[PDB]
């Protein structure tokens, strides 16, 4: 299957517009190469693959019934998570000098998600009876913030790529 297309892919999208390189019509643990390798639950029919930027703390987020920013306001899962997840570093790739703004994550949103929606809006998150009309400032914000990733970040603050391999069996 097209793994070298999906996995070792020079650009990965900010989570706010998470990729779905679904494959079809077509060991990773052993000889260790990656940080988080969890095959939760454990032939497939419809297999789903995803990749986005996160730091090294909040891999915790992407899981059934798990609570916080990249679960809540970016990418949330159901409670019966059958699949394999491959998370691993990308500090030598995702960390330029004096700022890495090539990445983003959704901060401001009224509600969390249900499982597996994508939502990409830059529409100004309504905060007060004072309107926004797109004119931000106070009572009117910009929904996202960038990760601003950079290299000396310790064990907590460095970008780590993720592979989500969710499966659906009709």
């Amino acid at each position, epitope marked *: 299957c097209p793994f070298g297309e999906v996995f070792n892919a020079t650009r990965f999208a900010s989570v706010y517009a998470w990729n779905r390189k679904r494959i079809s019509n077509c060991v990773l643990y052993n000889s260790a190469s990656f940080s988080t390798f969890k095959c939760y639950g454990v032939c497939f029919t419809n297999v789903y693959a995803d990749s986005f930027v996160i730091r090294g703390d909040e891999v915790r987020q992407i899981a059934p019934g798990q609570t916080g920013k990249i679960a809540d306001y970016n990418y949330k899962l159901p409670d019966d998570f059958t699949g394999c997840v491959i998370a691993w570093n990308s500090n030598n790739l995702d960390s330029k000098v*004096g*700022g890495n703004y090539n990445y983003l994550y959704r901060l401001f949103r009224k509600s969390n998600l249900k499982p597996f929606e994508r939502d990409i809006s*830059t529409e100004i998150y309504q905060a007060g009876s*004072t309107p926004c009309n797109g004119v931000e400032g106070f009572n009117c914000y*910009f929904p996202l*913030q960038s990760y601003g990733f950079q290299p000396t970040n310790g064990v907590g603050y460095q970008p780590y790529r993720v592979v989500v391999l969710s499966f659906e069996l009709l």
Partner: antibody
Amino acid sequence: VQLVQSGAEVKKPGASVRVSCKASGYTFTGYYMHWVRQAPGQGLEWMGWINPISDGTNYAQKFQGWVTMTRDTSISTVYMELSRLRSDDTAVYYCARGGSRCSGGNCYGWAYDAFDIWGQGTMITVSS
Amino acid sequence: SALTQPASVSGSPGQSITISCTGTSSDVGGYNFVSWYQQHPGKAPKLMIYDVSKRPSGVSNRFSGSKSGNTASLTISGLQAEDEADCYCSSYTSSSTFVFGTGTKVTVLG
């Protein structure tokens, strides 16, 4: 954590000017990018700001339209245009950094903490 | 769009000075977001006090301030001719904008 503005420029009345503010050594997108005017002898008049994450402007009710703020991600640099220049626009225009980290508990803090290097704008008809 | 300082304040060496920042019940009343900036001639502004009372590192503990009701205060203790500047106050507004005060010249006598 350091900012640097472009250098002093002269324009004949009617023209416009490009004026840049350049970040070094801190995350350029987390914090907002404001800009303030100090004419000779007067106080500091807030003008507007720009979200470095892709777009987004708010102006004060005297600079709207003819002031236009934009940014570019590649070299951590933000830009301000003054259209329809007339003589008493001649001033010193600062860019200001202070802005949108959070509204929460872990992270917060406002109030422009990193100003810049006082980029003059002189408007006159006389030649070099 | 109006936050009111006195144009002029005059203090003796060693003594303390008060520089109020009037703002009625919009941003100085219910919004603890008054901020103070200092400016020497030629130099760019410098952050004196942010967040009503707190101070940013490097700024002398001689500076201080509070905000209650409709008056915000910035108090310089043990004055110095070194401190002589323009001290602007600043708040953000329900109007979503950003607004500086009229500005206050400090002269330090003697």
